[PDB]
Design a protein around this nucleic acid. Sequence first.
DNA 1: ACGTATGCTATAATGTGTGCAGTCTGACGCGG
Lengths: 49, 277, 79, 50, 1350, 50, 49, 99
Amino acid sequence: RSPGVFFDSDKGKTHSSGKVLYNARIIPYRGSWLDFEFDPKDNLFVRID
Amino acid sequence: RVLDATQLYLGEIGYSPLLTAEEEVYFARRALRGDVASRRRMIESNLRLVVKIARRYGNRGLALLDLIEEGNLGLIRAVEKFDPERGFRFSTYATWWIRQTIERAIMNQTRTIRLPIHIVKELNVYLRTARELSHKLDHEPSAEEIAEQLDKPVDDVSRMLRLNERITSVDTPLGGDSEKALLDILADEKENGPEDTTQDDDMKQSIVKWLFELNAKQREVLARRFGLLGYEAATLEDVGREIGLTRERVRQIQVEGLRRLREILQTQGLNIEALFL
Amino acid sequence: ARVTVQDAVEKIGNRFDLVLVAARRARQMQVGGKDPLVPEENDKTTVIALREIEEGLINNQILDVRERQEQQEQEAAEL
Amino acid sequence: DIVLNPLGVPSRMNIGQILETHLGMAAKGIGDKINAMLKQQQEVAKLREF
Amino acid sequence: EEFDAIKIALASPDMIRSWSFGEVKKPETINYRTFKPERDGLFCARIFGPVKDYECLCGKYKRLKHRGVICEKCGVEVTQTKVRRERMGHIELASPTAHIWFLKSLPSRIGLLLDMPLRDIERVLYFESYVVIEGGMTNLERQQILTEEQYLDALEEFGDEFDAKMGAEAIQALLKSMDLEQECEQLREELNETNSETKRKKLTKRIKLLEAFVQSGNKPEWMILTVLPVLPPDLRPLVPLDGGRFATSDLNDLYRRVINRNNRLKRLLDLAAPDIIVRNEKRMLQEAVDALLDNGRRGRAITGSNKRPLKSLADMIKGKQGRFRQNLLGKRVDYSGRSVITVGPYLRLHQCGLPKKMALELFKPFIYGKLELRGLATTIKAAKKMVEREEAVVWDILDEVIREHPVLLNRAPTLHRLGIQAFEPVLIEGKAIQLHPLVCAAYNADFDGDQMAVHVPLTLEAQLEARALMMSTNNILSPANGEPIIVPSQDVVLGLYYMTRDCVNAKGEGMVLTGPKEAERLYRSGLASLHARVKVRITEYEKDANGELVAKTSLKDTTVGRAILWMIVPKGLPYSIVNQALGKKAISKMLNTCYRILGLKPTVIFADQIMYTGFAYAARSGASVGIDDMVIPEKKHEIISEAEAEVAEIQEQFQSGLVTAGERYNKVIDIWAAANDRVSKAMMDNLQTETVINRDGQEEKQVSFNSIYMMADSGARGSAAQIRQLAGMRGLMAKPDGSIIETPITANFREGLNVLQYFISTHGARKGLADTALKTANSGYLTRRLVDVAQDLVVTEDDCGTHEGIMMTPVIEGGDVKEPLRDRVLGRVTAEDVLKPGTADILVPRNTLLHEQWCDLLEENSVDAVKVRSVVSCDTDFGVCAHCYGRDLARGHIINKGEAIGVIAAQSIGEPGTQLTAAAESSIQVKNKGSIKLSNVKSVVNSSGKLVITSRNTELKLIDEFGRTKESYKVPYGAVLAKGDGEQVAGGETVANWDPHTMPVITEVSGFVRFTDMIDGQTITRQTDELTGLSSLVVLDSAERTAGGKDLRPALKIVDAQGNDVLIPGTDMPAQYFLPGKAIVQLEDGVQISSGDTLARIPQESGGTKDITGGLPRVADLFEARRPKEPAILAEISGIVSFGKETKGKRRLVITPVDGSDPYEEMIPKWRQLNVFEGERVERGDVISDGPEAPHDILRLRGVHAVTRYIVNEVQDVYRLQGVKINDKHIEVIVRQMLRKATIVNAGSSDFLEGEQVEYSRVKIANRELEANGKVGATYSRDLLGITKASLATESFISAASFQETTRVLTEAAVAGKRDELRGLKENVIVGRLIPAGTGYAYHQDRMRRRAAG
Amino acid sequence: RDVHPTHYGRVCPIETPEGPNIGLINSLSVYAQTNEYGFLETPYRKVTDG
Amino acid sequence: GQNMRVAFMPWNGYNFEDSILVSERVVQEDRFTTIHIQELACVSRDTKL
Amino acid sequence: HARSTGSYSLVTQQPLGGKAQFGGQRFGEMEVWALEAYGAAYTLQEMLTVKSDDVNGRTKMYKNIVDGNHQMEPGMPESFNVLLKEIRSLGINIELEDE
DNA sequence: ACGTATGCTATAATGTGTGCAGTCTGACGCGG
Ligand SMILES: [Mg+2]
Ligand SMILES: [Zn+2]
């Protein structure tokens, strides 16, 4: 997987909601990971590593 | 909260005295004369110093938690024998102890096959001499090239390199792919399979019939000597203990039993056939 | 006998108790050195035991009677 | 030289082998004609035209 | 060495000391130069024993002269090295340490017993907070955690009167103080008060643990280890390599971590060091102990040299790679060889080629044996050399022993029992094994480079077993289906096909022969073709009333080839069977016929002869694969060129803006789909009867002798499906996403693909072969899952003495009867005197085998439904009876007692799935005349004048003249019927019609449409067009829906002209149809409607070929009993329905039975529609809601024979879709095992009481003594169990740990102190004893009478 | 594992073991070459004004 | 590999499931006969003895 | 490949694996269930003990075959005797309770 | 005497971190 940025979405993490939760992820060549992700209530979260 | 044994201890040292020059002397003077609480403090205080010393002695043999424990034992022996009357600081004196106690405990619990300090100490100088040579030879030094710079024995260098030879665990995968380890390959030495077990059983049973098929006074001083039928393997002179009580007649009767048995192997179809074996 | 073992299963019934009866008889000829009832015709114990069962000479009742008949001869004789 | 099974073909659907066979035969047919003229020791112009 | 049981209990510190022969106090393995144990080290000989057989270390006492002498200097005994893996050790832990398996292996166990959480205990262990052991001053109560601050507060204020400590020391004291006697009574009292579900569950589990703990004799203190056992050094080896290197197991390394830290703690307790350091040392010690027992569990597994984790103890007992599965159930085996297999077309069925040099090494001890007998060898090393030299006369002895000696041939993978078959080895010079072509089917062995393992049966019993059970001749039919697996294929079928198949005149037409020998005479003479119509004299034999065979001579008009085949045909079968052109499907009946008539012998001969003549005549034919054989139809370029312009037409309409992209996408697929079937049929119409050019006088029409067609028509290789790709059109390919390409592949393999056509072919090709590798593991794992639960089932009794059975009914669906009352009830013992229609004379008795001939009389009498003696209806405790099972389908007559079915069943089910890896149903046309008979149907007439159906599961029957069901269909919801209920229809009439790519929502009432909870943006969306502006509304579901309109249900409410609701006829329900997600709506708000109009259309995309990849997970879920996410509701007890109270649409139901006074309430969703409409006569388990049925819901209400009928239908539906043939009895086996445990409801004579869930057989044995003694009955209610769970439930813990969850099984079994007395197979295969089944059944029961006799 | 339409000209659709390491391992295309940054690239004939 | 005159047809089941029937004349020309260079080693070690 | 009797494993005490090391073919659990289905009980017990671990069995059986007496003489595989001590090393009382 | 083991040094130094992060369906177990 090529370093840089990448936008994905588990088309239904919780098929309970069945909501397409969109997420972004910064992939470096060396360094820590930087992810941004929504949730059932569309609250933006960040999860380093 | 915190459930890492590492961070828990590292927390408890982070809340411990950080002593001044005259503080060290006040506690230490009472510590030698046994204040109990004093010996506890100086120690509690300088656990932080043990951690920074184990930070440089890590990733070499044992874990960081194993260096701190044995590094703490160096600080304690430093407290058991410090000189407060001397104007020189404690942090200086304790460092010599904590660096020593760590190195020593690594030399023991690093290798599976226990290597005493003598063989090890020397090994290091052979290896550290290899550094010098490697940089200027640009070629990893041979057993000879190390022997020519120290002017020391060839077998010494070689035998010390044999003890450096490291291990592969039996349960280690093969080809970087969980398929089969070494135990699912490595044979058992001790027990040879039925074919070798029945070899000796059949070979010995035939021998028992051969002794009963030979003369009764010829297999009485032959099997009792070699320890075939008897209980102890005696010699020509020792067969005199039984009933023979002879040295010349025992040697003539031993060989007479073997001569008639050599004709028994030429007629069965062995002799030169079973000579290769 | 060599290909078929159905003719042997016809006589006893249980495919499993057939192997046990045939084995026990095969062992008597293999160890005791007992005589085969059917012409052996260069076949191993395996086949011969099946032949005797197939034609109807060997049975659970037959072999148990014959056992204690050799063993009762020994009883009367000893004491 | 070898006798292959024709049933290892329909189910497989690898008709390339049959075309390999046909062309190989044609190719050999041409070698067999050239082999014959070289054995017969004919001519440079006759081989050239063919 | 001969025992009865195996026990598991908790290791007491005192107990561990009993096994240990010393205390390892040093990490020292060996000395560096002197390769010998160190002083009280990990390889110490003073603790674990001596090195060699009878030799001390220093060398003072040697061999047996000093039998059991203990040396002075080194202090080492002189016994065998035997003891180095038997003798254990121990370590005296300075401070007590907790067991990870009684802390982390959930349930907590140590925490479950204390009534204490995990966090609380762990923070005590890692020294974060103290815990109270016992407060004298009631100020602090027990098991109350105090932070480091809160401990100090109680110390100066209260102190002393409160005893609280920290670390594993504390929790041990807590376990040592707690009273199992008192806290058991306390919990029982709290249970009498007001009991719920969760409260009673928790209490009962704890209660039983407490009683179990007292009766197991275990003490809760042993959860904490004061003593730590050491594994014998030979079991954690330090052995030297040939290369001068050494190697050690990771246990030795993990042991050195434990001993070092433990000894360092002894040192720090000597120094009285400050507690902060002692804390780290205790945390470390625990880390090391927990890493030794189970490394990867509590935290990071301690990684070692090659950055990999150290293999711990638990790991060698854990899962695949553990001792069970890898080094105990699975073994490499002697008298074994494997090699490339090749064909053996010369062999008979009972024969197989075995290389000489293979059989040489294999039969090594049998050569040495026969050699000493002849007197050629005096001893064995003499015989060894005789063999080595490979001298001439040794081959002749080897050749002697092998005769009349069977060998086992295995092929991987071993799916079903037939994966091994025995033969009589035939020595062949060559390193290749030669296998019999007909049994290739059982192994699935392709000669494309397959290898087969050989095994020599040593014991005479094994020679008899191999010849009796495992011989290829005794194994014909599959156990799965009563059908022959030994059946020609490939060349053999083609050869017979060529022979029988006929042709016009030819050489010597209409000639006249004495016999089938004159036909061989004339063909091989060159004066007749195998395809000549001829009159011949044949004598066909037919059997009499008794065994006597009658002969009958007759003239037959057949071909020269058919005549020659009659020669192979045994006399007893009719001639009409070979009078047709023989194919694979026809040939499979020949062998079956031959078997059911003559017997075994005749078939084996017949089988071989069929094979021989098949190969020979196949090779005589010269059948080939030319490229002119791949005939393309005349007019392919005519079909495509104009089917392209068809698609080009819509393409221009789309860009204009009328036909939408989605409609075009479906519309273009239909054009290509028609063109594809157009080319396919034009191809075979020009290829099947290509031979239209004959002779005789002028012309005649005839079957085509095109090589490819013959090879497909005969059923030899390929089919009409494959030929399509060859000569016709490749067809439409599929994207890796799942969507189908609009443009398919026009070319075929003859014409050549272009560059993309291949690129497109790839997508489908790689994903099809990806599911060959990956999806096989789910199907192979199913085989494993099924087996473990069905291990114990063996035929035990002869007659269970029960007159119960499941009532099987003829399976009819799709128009053609899927499984008739004949096929479905064959080999099933009648459980009920079932006679003929006229109930006045008995036709069939009770306990009787239903044979095919007896089944023929079922056809004459036309049986309606039969109560078959089933497996689940069996009363035999621990197994089943031969009557309940019926015939062994593999054999062909009633099953032997002792035969182990459960395993045979599991194999039969998993075998096909593992080897096994155009829905335009627009309209039903009825074919025979009949009266239309609908059932479970509620329709309503529409504006048009058409009977529209408003019920989901509507079935359509076809009733004949006398009044019996011939054809059967599934009419779906909102389908339009041509004729209603009871009306006559003619043959070839469309009785029903509907749109397949849509699921309409149809009304029952007329009036106007109202929008309720259809807010734009929250629940639905809107999209308009142009000039006028027709807008469509699309209903969003919880996936495309915001949090605003989540509890809003969108529905199209019906109203009248005034604006009020319209009641649905004969109910108080205002009309309201709830629309589901992605529902497309064309009518907007304020539109007039009649009854029968479509309100919305729900899209029904189903373009995924289910195949076997996407239908086995459905089988799994069924067996594993996983409730669906929309279960259908059923009525509990019979009586009067009475609708009750409601909660924002959530419906309740206050059902008040006629006899039962106490009401029963159950809740129902809003969006879900029911089937019944209130105030009704409901019975036990009527269908209330529609959708997937929950397996637990079925047995709970409608009993055993309802859930068994469900699983059997449901499972088979998936396998029938794939053409997998399995007898229902095999599924019924697993079903039975899934009904093993049962919850008790009512107190009994034994201390059963409520909440306990015991096995069904044990509780029924108690009921046996109860009806004899009186006392109190133990009433019950059978529960259903999933496979994975049913395996772990068996009282055998050995069988459970051997399966999975091995870490948990053992811990639960240790705490219970359970003793396994061994009943299962896994149990006795492990210990390497006689299997309590099959051959061993006769032996194991002869030991059971040793126990019975006193 | 599935063949992706990017593979065109870059990676071969028919070159990969049929074993569990099926779709991951892949041979490079004939005229395929590495992009100066890392991605793949395939030759293409430019069309100038038709 | 090597090309050769091949003929597609069954032969008494010696080409059953893709099984191959090769002439002795192929074996006579030794044309599919292969070469296998195998490397074996002998190590003189220094044992404790 | 072919094998009658040869090398034996280090702890499992069953034969090694492959013609590389001269090891017998593996008879896995799937191979085992096949014989369970047949009913052939000795053929399996023979392949669990004398042909694999059973140290008494393998050598004893060898001697019986050369004598001609192909007689079943089981004892109990070492790999199980290992599993007993392995569970005892994990602090669990696992003893063989007799008749 | 030989091999192994135990012992001390005095500039000052006083709180670690390290390393793979497209597995996945299914099933419980503690809080909230
Ligand atoms: Mg294959
Ligand atoms: Zn000694």
